[PDB]
Structure formats: structure tokens, C-alpha cells
Amino acid sequence: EVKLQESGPGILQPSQTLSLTCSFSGFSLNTYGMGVGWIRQPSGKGLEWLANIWWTDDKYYNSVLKSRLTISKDTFNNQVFLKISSVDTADTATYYCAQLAYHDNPWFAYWGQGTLVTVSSASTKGPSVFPLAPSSGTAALGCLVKDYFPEPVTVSWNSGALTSGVHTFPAVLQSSGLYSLSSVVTVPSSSLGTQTYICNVNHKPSNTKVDKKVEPKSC
Amino acid sequence: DIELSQSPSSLAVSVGEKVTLSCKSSQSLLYSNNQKNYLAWYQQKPGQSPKLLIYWASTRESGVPDRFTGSGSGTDFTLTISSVKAEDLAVYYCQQYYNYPTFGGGTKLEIKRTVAAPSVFIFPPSDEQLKSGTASVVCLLNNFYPREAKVQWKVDNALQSGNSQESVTEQDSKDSTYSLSSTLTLSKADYEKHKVYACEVTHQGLSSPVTKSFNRGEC
């Protein structure tokens, strides 16, 4: 099976050089007809192709961005790199790497999860995590994830064991210039006594990993 | 390069119905010397990476159900979805690889479903957060349709203005409802000095507006 993982800075400053890594298994740029593409997507906007590199080490660039792009691979042909020089606010986007279609076909067969890249001079800040305690048929509980920069935070419940009824809201930028969101889950009232509800909150850029037990409050 | 133009920009369709997504090309994608059309279609579900549906305009990627059909030739292409499932909620993109890849702006497929009234929950600030000298009151509107909802904050029965932010989810990929968070931001001082905190929800599936409220300190 094919697997791609993007790696990126999370945040870098205007004018700095963006450096992205695509690490892949299940295929190689040793093999004939194999290649890797880069595609980006601003929040709520569409897809822009950036560059392709193939087993031949042939490099094809977006004509508009050409002069700012560099794409390469290593000798092991297990990793592909993309540089973008002199980044500006408009380069803020989600960046995907993709396996190019088997036997020299320039559509995108399998995509990686994508890494979010924010172009900002503001400093990284880790989230505070706060329980939203269930009130005492259906109950609601959750975690307020507050005062972090930049995007994103990842929220899971019970290390991924709990997914049904989970709602993780889009971040909103507060007047402070820091993002805040809540992750909420709806459960049976009859489960509040027994089932454990832990929110797992990961903020890569600040190396923050908080787990919060949410339990009915004490009067 | 080649420009792709997708219409309509957004589709609202009931489950079981048939939709036709158009992709117009600024140059013909039909190569005379192989009689192939150099167009691919992708599906991006909310939260996910784009996934390949169609290549060569009309060939299904393996695993893609028969109800997705790619069609057209030259400058005019269609993706037909013959009986829309709720899981089909996504942005659908066309991409040409006749020249250097370009994408259309995408068509957002939304699910038209029956009215569902929100379930409304309110959460006091955690004691943990009150230590930090700031207070966040959270109101949850859960699993409702349509998206349009009015949320009003009352502190000691006085209407609040300019101190709340809302965040809405994408349409659910399962039951096709939305959820909404309204967060009231107060100083720990302002919160501690007032008593009654009320969230008032107006949505069209409710005979009258629903209010959820608590008094600071009480149970």
C-alpha cells in the first residue's frame, strides 16, 4: 500500500524559504514511470499545482511560481523536497505531496494528509485546554482549546477510540491574534457515571500534548 | 496555461437524486493522435485530502462506485452522480494534464435534507480557566438543519453585543446536519460580578426560541 507524509515548518516568517519534505513508502523513484507532485490549498479556496519530479530527475514547475520553486529527491529516492523562496502571506496554505499516476501519467493517484503552513512574524504559543463539564436522554461535554498560534491543533477523544457524535469546530482568531476552538461530543446521560472521556490535544509547532479528563462537576 | 471553469459553483441536492457537474476548458483536451481526453476528477470530503475518481475523462479509478460517471470531450466535460448518497458531500475538482496541471475552482455538493431543530447546551467557565483571569461561556447548537440560526447572549437578563464569536461545522458526512458554537468572552472580574448566564437560540425547527441558562455558583 502507498503512504505519503508531508513534513513542514508549521510557521515561518515573511521572506524566509519554505522547505517541505515528502516521505513515501510502497513505491520508489528508483522504479520506471514513478514521480511525486506538490499541490497547495488556501483555507476554503481550491487547488494549485506547484511542481513534479520523476525517476529521470526531470523537474516541471508552475510557470507563475517557477522562479521561486526548487524540487529535488535524495539518492535513496524515498524522499522528495520542495523549496519556495521569499514567502509572503499568499503562500499560507495546506501543502500536499502526491504519487503521480503509474507509468508516466501526470494526474495525482494518491495524496498525503497535507501539512498547514502559516506565513507570519508572530511567535508560536501552545494551547491552554479546559474541560466543558456535562450538565447535571443526551448529554454534551467537551474541551475548550484556547490561546494558541499558529493553526493547527489536532483533537481526538479517548486516543481515537471515541469518534461518533464528536464535533471539532473550526478555529476562530480572537482579538489577541490567538486561535481558540472547542471539541464537543454528545453521549447518553446514562453513560456519565461509567464511561471515561479524555480529550487528546496536540499542537505540533509548540510541541504541546495535553490530555484532559472531562467529568461531571463537583458542587 | 489552460484554464478550467466549473459550474455550478455550489449544488444543493436531496439523497437519491441525480446531479451533473460541468468542467469547461479554455483549450481542447482531446489529442487527435491517441483520441484521449486529458482530464481527471477528484473528490475532497470535509477534513480529507483529494481522492482520485476519474482519469482520461471517462475511466473510473478502481474502488470508485459505478454511480460516478465521467463524460464529455474537447472543451466540455461532466461528472454525473446518479443517486447522491449523504457521504458524497464534498468539493469536486476537475484537472487537465494536457499541459502543466491546472484545476477548476471546484463544485461544492451540499445535501438538502429535512428540518432538524438544534439540541442546545450551555457550559460555565471551568475553575481551571477562572485561575487564568479570563472566562469563556460556551453555547452548543447540535445536529440541526438548515445552517441559519440566531444565538443571543444575556448576562443578568441584559442582551450582550460585540463579545461573542460563533464557529459552524461543515455539513456532517453521515446525517447531513450542522453544529454551531457561540463563545462569550468576559474578564474573570465581569463574570464573577454577574450571576445569570443565558443562551437564546432561534432556529426554524423550534415552535419558540429555546433558552439554556445557569447561575454562577449554583447546581
Binding site: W49, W54, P106 | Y98, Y100
Partner: peptide, 8 residues
């Protein structure tokens, strides 16, 4: 004619 982002 095709000029793809791909070797001849």
C-alpha cells in the same frame, strides 16, 4: 498537442 508535466 500535449506538453504534460511528465517526461516524453
Amino acid at each position: 498537442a500535449p506538453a504534460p508535466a511528465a517526461p516524453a
